[PDB]
């Protein structure tokens, strides 16, 4: 409770550059609170993550998601898991920030774009090189 | 009245499979999907917001949610997330022959009962639906 609890959702399926962005976002998020992710759950479970391993990852991640004060998601790469975390987050009435790169050529899911209300659920477009500045802008106004 | 079924889905194999699944689900109930919401649009600003609110209403009304989860999709995941919170019975369908490893968050959502994740090969999808729904 000392610090805001932040939960981050993102995909790394696109390779090294996706991993670097993932780490860049999580690193800047730490400025503004404690950060938990599905990667942290999978890292802690190690070998047990195995038969039934995905169930333990899911239960641990959902437990952290439910406790979060803000849920941040990078929604550029299509991802069932990121969509699912967002859907659970909405039903937990979490404040949500989604980050999208229009550079990707992609059209953001209508279901995700359609969930934004401008305040409690927001979708921010960004380019390579400004995600740290935008995260600052978001959290320096709404810790 | 009839059981209300909500189908979540996203390539030739993919389109024909979507069509096959929706067709077979009609044997058990009426079927609504996100594409039916989008087709409601002819025009636009606020258009995605309308799709979202319409799909959410149909999802909340559904007796069973069925999702094809072979292709990565933020929408299908979002729908599943909302359906879990709506305490809905959920059936996900995954094709291992895709070469992909299903998302841990989806595979791990399964509890064997109200949330089930079934691997399948394309030729047997109608038979699996028959098994679930009869
Ligand atoms: Cl890369
Ligand atoms: Cl995925
Ligand atoms: Cl809109
Ligand atoms: Cl209607
Ligand atoms: Cl998507
Ligand atoms: Cl919901
Ligand atoms: Cl199962
Ligand atoms: Cl197949």
Please describe the topology of this protein.
Two copies of one chain form a homodimer.
Chain A: E1 5-9, H1 16-29, E2 34-37, H2 38-45, H3 53-67, E3 70-74, H4 80-91, E4 95-100, H5 110-113, E5 121-125, H6 131-141
Parallel strand pairs in A: 1-2, 1-3, 3-4, 4-5
Helix pairs in contact in A: 1-6, 2-3
The complex binds chloride ion (8 copies).
Descriptive terms for the model:
homodimer, 143 residues, alpha/beta, Rossmann fold, five-stranded parallel beta sheet, 6 helices, 45% helix, 17% strand, binds chloride ion, nucleus (chain A), phosphoprotein (chain A), EC 3.2.2.- (chain A)
- Biggest sheet layout of chain A: 5 strands, parallel
Structural class of chain A: alpha/beta
CATH topology of chain A: Rossmann fold
Can you tell me the CATH class of chain A? Alpha Beta
The assigned CATH architecture of chain A is 3-Layer(aba) Sandwich
State the share of residues found in helices of chain A, binned by percent: 40-55%
Rg of chain A to the nearest angstrom?
15 Å
Give the number of domains of chain A. 1
Range of strand content of chain A: 15-25%
| Most extensive contact | A-B, 39 and 36 residues
Family (chain B): Belongs to the 2'-deoxynucleoside 5'-phosphate N-hydrolase 1 family.
Protein name (chain B): 5-hydroxymethyl-dUMP N-hydrolase
Subunit structure (chain B): Monomer and homodimer.
Subcellular location (chain B): Cytoplasm; Nucleus
């Amino acid at each position: 409770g000392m610090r805001p609890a932040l939960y981050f959702c993102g995909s790394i399926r696109g390779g090294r550059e996706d991993r670097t962005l993932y780490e860049r976002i999580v690193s800047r998020l730490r400025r503004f609170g404690t950060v938990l992710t599905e990667h942290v759950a999978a890292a802690e479970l190690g070998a047990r993550g195995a038969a039934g391993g995905d169930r333990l990852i899911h239960e641990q991640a959902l437990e952290w998601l439910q406790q979060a004060d803000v849920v941040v998601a990078e929604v550029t790469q299509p991802s069932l898991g990121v969509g699912y975390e967002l859907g659970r987050a909405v039903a937990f009435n979490k404040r949500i920030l989604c980050l999208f790169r229009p550079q990707s050529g992609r059209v953001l899911s209508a279901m995700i774009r359609g969930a934004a209300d401008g305040s409690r659920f927001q979708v921010w477009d960004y380019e390579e090189g400004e995600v740290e500045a935008l995260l600052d802008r978001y959290f320096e106004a709404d810790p």
